[PDB]
Each structure stands twice: as structure tokens, then as C-alpha cells.
Amino acid sequence: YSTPKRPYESSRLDAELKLAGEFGLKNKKEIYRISFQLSKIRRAARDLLTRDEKDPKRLFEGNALIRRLVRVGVLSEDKKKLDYVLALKVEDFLERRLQTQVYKLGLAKSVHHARVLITQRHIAVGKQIVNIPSFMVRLDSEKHIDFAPTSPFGGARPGRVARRNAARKAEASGE
């Protein structure tokens, strides 16, 4: 990662929390590291705007870089002219996080309720249970995001607190 140049500066400091307010983060470390990767791409993005048209460096190291941005699910395909790459911004990597995509797809009624649902052995995307909120969905995995076979809200067990609630009824009311 890299720290930004100025640590305390008014229009940027409040611009932190309006990112922390919508997305629901916990550390500006999880903001700065995202800008850090966007920093390294963007320097490379300006490199291929200097060289010649139809350079195979501008082809092979350009278009695959363009297609990888379509592959991560950020660059829409209409803007596929390598001139929207400068017009990228911070929230689009924040938008492709595994936490926020849960709330967009119904099912969470918050961005903070979905944060708790990541770390409790719930929702998987493929057959792998994901419990890191920054899993960065690749746009070919959206309509596989679903409740687990186990871990209720998905069924076949009601769980240790629902079974304990069942246990209380049998011992005092019943036997």
C-alpha cells in the first residue's frame, strides 16, 4: 500500500466517511489500499497513451489490460476505447466488493447486515464459502451468489439457538 500525501485535509477527510457511510467499511486502510492498486494501473494507463497507434505493446499490453477491466466487472463494454480508463474513479472498485453486492441483490436490507452475514459461515458464491468481504466478484459469478446448503436461511438445520429455543419448550412445558 501507500499512504496519501496529506493526512488531514478538510474536503478529503469528510469524503472519507461518505465512502464509509455508503459502503460500510472499518478502516481507511481498506480505502487507501484500493486507491493504491488504482494508482499503479493508472500510471500504466498513461504510458500507452503516449506511444504509437496500433503498437503491439498498445495491443497486447493494452487490450488485455482493457479486457481484464471488463473481466473484473468494472469497465462497461460500451466505454471500450481506452479513453474511459482515465475516467475511472474510486467507488467502482468499492462497488465490486463482495459485501456491497449482497445488499444490491436483495437479501441484506443494509450494508452492515451483510457484513455480519459474511463472517458467520453463510453465503457462498460458488461451492466455496466466502468469508472475506473483499472477494471482488468477476461479473460471471453474480447470479450464483446464494444462501448455503447448510447454515439456515438455507435449511436442513435450524441451528444452535433455534434448537436451544426448541429445547426450552420440551423441558418446562412438556417433559
Binding site: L17, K18, A20, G21, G24, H112, R115
Partner: peptide, 30 residues
């Protein structure tokens, strides 16, 4: 050592602050 802070830790402190910020913002712009 003091028993003074009771204020939450980590994520829950950032949620409350955002809500307060929005409330403050509604007034002055409106």
C-alpha cells in the same frame, strides 16, 4: 485508569458517525 469510555469499537462507531453526519447535513443545505 478511568471507567469513562463506553463507546463502541470498530465498525459500529463508523456507522453512528455517518448517521449523525447525514443529520447535520440535512439542516444547512436542506
Amino acid at each position: 485508569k478511568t471507567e469513562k469510555p463506553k463507546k463502541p469499537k470498530g465498525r459500529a462507531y463508523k456507522r453512528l458517525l455517518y448517521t449523525r453526519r447525514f443529520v447535520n447535513v440535512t439542516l444547512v443545505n436542506g
